[PDB]
Design a binder for this molecule. Sequence first.
Ligand SMILES: [Zn+2]
Length: 42
Amino acid sequence: MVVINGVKYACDSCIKSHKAAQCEHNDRPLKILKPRGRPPTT
Ligand SMILES: [Zn+2]
């Protein structure tokens, strides 16, 4: 996975899987993520 400033990211084959724990792939579409969030309502 990758992180910038205070943002997180990883391949769709990790962030969606779990390997993101230490993703280091190249190909494949990347994505972003953060330390939990949750909706404002539901
Ligand atoms: Zn990956």
